[PDB]
Amino acid sequence: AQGTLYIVSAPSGAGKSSLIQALLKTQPLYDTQVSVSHTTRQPRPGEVHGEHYFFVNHDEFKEMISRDAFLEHAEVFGNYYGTSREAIEQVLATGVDVFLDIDWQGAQQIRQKMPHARSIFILPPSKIELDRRLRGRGQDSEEVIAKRMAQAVAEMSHYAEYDYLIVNDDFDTALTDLKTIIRAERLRMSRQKQRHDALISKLLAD
Amino acid sequence: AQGTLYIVSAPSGAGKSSLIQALLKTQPLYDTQVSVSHTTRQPRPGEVHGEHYFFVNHDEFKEMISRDAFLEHAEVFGNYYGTSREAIEQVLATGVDVFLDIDWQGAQQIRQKMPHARSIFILPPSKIELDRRLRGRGQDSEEVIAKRMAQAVAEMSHYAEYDYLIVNDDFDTALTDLKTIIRAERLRMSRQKQRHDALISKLLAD
Amino acid sequence: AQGTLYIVSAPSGAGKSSLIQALLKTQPLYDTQVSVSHTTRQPRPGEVHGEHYFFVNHDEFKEMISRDAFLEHAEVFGNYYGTSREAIEQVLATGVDVFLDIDWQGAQQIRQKMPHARSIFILPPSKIELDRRLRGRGQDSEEVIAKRMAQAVAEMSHYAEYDYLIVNDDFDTALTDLKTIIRAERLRMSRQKQRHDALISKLLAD
Amino acid sequence: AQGTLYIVSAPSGAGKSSLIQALLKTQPLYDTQVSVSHTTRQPRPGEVHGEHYFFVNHDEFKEMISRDAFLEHAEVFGNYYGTSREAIEQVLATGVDVFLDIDWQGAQQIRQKMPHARSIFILPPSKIELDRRLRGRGQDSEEVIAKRMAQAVAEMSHYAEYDYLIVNDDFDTALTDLKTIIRAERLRMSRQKQRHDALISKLLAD
Amino acid sequence: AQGTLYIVSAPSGAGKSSLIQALLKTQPLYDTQVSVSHTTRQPRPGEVHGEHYFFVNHDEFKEMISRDAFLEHAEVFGNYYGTSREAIEQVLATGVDVFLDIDWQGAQQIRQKMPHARSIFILPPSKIELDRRLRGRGQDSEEVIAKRMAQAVAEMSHYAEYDYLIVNDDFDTALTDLKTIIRAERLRMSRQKQRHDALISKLLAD
Amino acid sequence: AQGTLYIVSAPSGAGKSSLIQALLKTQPLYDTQVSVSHTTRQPRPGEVHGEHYFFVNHDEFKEMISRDAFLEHAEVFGNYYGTSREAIEQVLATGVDVFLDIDWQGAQQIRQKMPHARSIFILPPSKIELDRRLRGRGQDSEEVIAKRMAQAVAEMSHYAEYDYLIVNDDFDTALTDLKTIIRAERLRMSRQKQRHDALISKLLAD
Ligand SMILES: Nc1nc2c(ncn2[C@@H]2O[C@H](COP(=O)(O)O)[C@@H](O)[C@H]2O)c(=O)[nH]1
């Protein structure tokens, strides 16, 4: 019937976006999808329009805030980002789970708006590695990294507001962790009661 | 700090006890254990005292009901079975998760008594196979099987009271399912907040 | 020496094409490949020429039927589709297994033509979910879905003609199932007798 | 309805019995079991009566050959071994797959008697390791090992009579191989047509 | 030809013995085995002679120190423990890897004596859980636990002397870690050069 | 701090490049990356500039040899290939492991230059399959294949210079093998001592 919203947040460099992406590779569109956000920030190298993000002017965005197009929006690390209402509501009507790769501010917003949403915070094994991971993928640059690490602390302090916590120490353990959370929620009685309406009905008979 | 109670019920022959047993083989005593019940029913062949059950006279049991020794007890399939208070409370104090292999009546009891308990009902792919599985393990005999199948229907109708549902169609898929439920609960914020008190504290600092 | 043909069919929306695709991601070109079909039907959004299909006019196709270019061809869901002879025969000469994503009509054709071919039918857990999966991937549209579901029944009734059956209840269980069928066929004596000609010869000696 | 017989043979020391044993650890009695043979040979250390074998006098056995108690029997490595009819036929009636840990002579016997049986030969990566494995498990002794290696060659030459071949190079790859063969046979149309009679019937309806 | 010694040490309660035991369950005797130590300490409940340990008087042991029977021996947590020479040397001659569940003192001893030995230290995620694990398995008692935790610090400070480190945060991640170390060492050129002498020779020919 | 260089070589057609590629799919850029080489050889079909290779004229390359741009370079199978210094040194500074898909000549070069580098040779199960794999992926053509097989022997004779050996008999076993080698090296004390500096410090305290 209705699918489930999965908020996922982390200090930049924890590897959250790379986890969510590896997960969807093993997950068909009919079960799981991700929301593509709008944002003012400049496209990094080898980042196409309409896949990772929808890239729009600070002008275009201030007007989306106005036309009320966003389920949530916020300022993080000096730029505007947002999750458009139209897309999300459609996909969720079709029983498909949708992932939101958003910050703590966005998460707080979605939690009032959509109270059945589930949220996962991902932590690094140390701030020393948070910095190392950032430099290690050639996406981002010197100025931008120091900016993000200043807030890395403040980001991580919101961890307790989330339903689930993953320490991404080692990428493959972490991906299993995330796969599991999804798998286990799909074994909850509400959801399994629909998907096996078929079976149950015949079981209870002769 | 405190561990979690996992009620697991199923129509006889669904393979619930064999799943719980395979799970504990891959799970150390310090993380996971199972409660050993008392019961009037006669020991099957190759079933030792003090491992699968505590075998006691209908006399001995009527007195345990009296001395109030049980967290829960009930009549199922013509015999008395029970979960002793003393054992459970001890093990749970030590942060260890404990499994209860009990019927629907027992589950309803534990749910009022211990409201944070989680419960899993396991269903077979059909009643035709429920019977086949019963005959297929040489435990049980002709009389006893027909008795149990009469109630198999009534057992399965309580499935909706549980938090999680597993269709044990194929044993190894089912065991993963159960392993997962446990794994995912241990990723919930409450529990992960203790076990990583260490880490969190240092993360939020310099 | 010679590779094996794997026919795979299913009511539209069962997730057969998405399974076959996930399988090939973990399977090198020298062991496993898929046939690319020709078809009159219009390309869906984000579907390139020469990868998913070869898109040709109803004109171009009627002439391929004439020049006898197809190992098999048929009318399904209002359009023409076909598997070209030239491509298949080449790849199979090189010991590589080839997958055919074709309907029941096509399967019956290949079975007379190529009797050692193995066939797998994939079923959904219910027709209620068959429809849900179709709407859930944004490929296809309103008109087209109702058309396909009318025949979903008739499609599924041919299941018994196939060598293997998979109930795609949960995508990842299903992908293991399919991976397994391939793996197990490669453990058959005929095939293993070539690939270990080396070893066997020395074993039987001193 | 009816289960399947799995003959498994190998030159002594290939690790066939240890594979079959590890497999059953992950396989419930209602799906999979193993036949316990009778034999004249002396019990090794830490080998109990009635689990690995039924240990009987050369006298007791010559009489079983007479009373026709065996589905198959033979002389291998200087002793008599046998698979009793009574046990096998029972277990197979209940839909449970049964494994036969028997030699080539026994396999040839069962193949005429029970033509739907499936057979797996397991080979070592070299005869140099066959000897090493034999000495490496403290079961067996000096005299006995040299005796068995003389026939190791002759044993391995019957490999081509079997349906499936496994090269047990590395134990865990080999165990997956064997698990797979079983899994894939249970996905064959005959067997899956019973176990999902339920589902199929409803699929083909409205 | 010759097998490899695997020293494994940890502060009591880290779960090292339970890991080593789960590992051997998936590992045949011809590839992997564990040394059974002698010790003065009293047998815990449900601990048999000759499996976990060889239980001997302080008298019997002082004489083994004298007759020089031990490859290594030491005083840990108020008792004497030791690894007997005779057993180890035998098993290693047969190409089988042997595990030593010993303390830091023992490890230092074996490292001079047997320089190709590999060593793994296992750490807990915190000392708070080290204590929790100890109480959580009903083996050990109040007095004994506080004694061990006093030295838990001193034990863990020797971690840097070992070749490999595992943080046993979550039992199943840890068991994979250990399985891996073994697997990877068996892929080293020295060892793989013997086990595939066969193959290599033929590869390099025509 | 500093990452590790992984040389990987094999006779053409062994499947080494396809393994390395499947590995990186499950490995984030912050942990693992691959070096992109320069080469004179002509781009095969469906091979883009700047991903598989940097395609340059025999002219452009002779000048790179001159300007000393390469960590290593060599002539293999009638063409020039090379690993540029600039790229490698950067990525390794950031703690990321880098893979080098290079021949034996290149490997010998890197081993003097960078002595902590680890090297893996991959062998096919036979030369008969080496040829089959080459023809089986439509990359390469008739002339080119016979040329490479002549040297396949000479390539494989350098196997003993490497630290680790993989027999790529079956692709998925082989990929696990390679994943493992990486995983196990990251469990070595040197590397784990940095990545858990955090944890260790607190463990050794109260
Ligand atoms: N609130 C909000 N945050 C997002 C959105 N999309 C990405 N961000 C957040 O912005 C931060 C930086 O994103 P990045 O610059 O790496 O793309 C991350 O913490 C990410 O979760 C969005 O649509 N809304």
Ligand SMILES: Nc1nc2c(ncn2[C@@H]2O[C@H](COP(=O)(O)O)[C@@H](O)[C@H]2O)c(=O)[nH]1
């Ligand atoms: N209420 C309750 N049910 C149990 C207990 N132990 C086993 N039973 C239940 O009794 C039924 C039959 O158990 P069995 O005869 O197979 O051992 C099962 O459904 C099982 O869950 C118990 O201690 N209390």
Ligand SMILES: Nc1nc2c(ncn2[C@@H]2O[C@H](COP(=O)(O)O)[C@@H](O)[C@H]2O)c(=O)[nH]1
């Ligand atoms: N006979 C035949 N059927 C195919 C071929 N290619 C795809 N189809 C079948 O046509 C149906 C719909 O395909 P679709 O429109 O989703 O691409 C599916 O059942 C699919 O198996 C083909 O080349 N020949």
Ligand SMILES: Nc1nc2c(ncn2[C@@H]2O[C@H](COP(=O)(O)O)[C@@H](O)[C@H]2O)c(=O)[nH]1
């Ligand atoms: N024919 C036959 N062979 C068996 C039987 N049980 C074990 N053997 C075979 O005898 C050989 C040696 O058995 P072992 O001495 O190791 O127990 C093995 O190849 C094994 O397959 C049996 O019941 N019948």
Ligand SMILES: Nc1nc2c(ncn2[C@@H]2O[C@H](COP(=O)(O)O)[C@@H](O)[C@H]2O)c(=O)[nH]1
């Ligand atoms: N040196 C040495 N230590 C061992 C031996 N066997 C067990 N111990 C060590 O003694 C400590 C406590 O063992 P436990 O009392 O738990 O059996 C552990 O750290 C364990 O590694 C041994 O044979 N020699």
Ligand SMILES: Nc1nc2c(ncn2[C@@H]2O[C@H](COP(=O)(O)O)[C@@H](O)[C@H]2O)c(=O)[nH]1
């Ligand atoms: N020395 C060296 N060999 C490489 C380099 N890149 C690829 N080659 C090697 O050249 C051989 C053929 O490469 P291919 O033609 O298949 O791309 C392979 O053995 C491969 O390892 C390189 O940069 N340096």
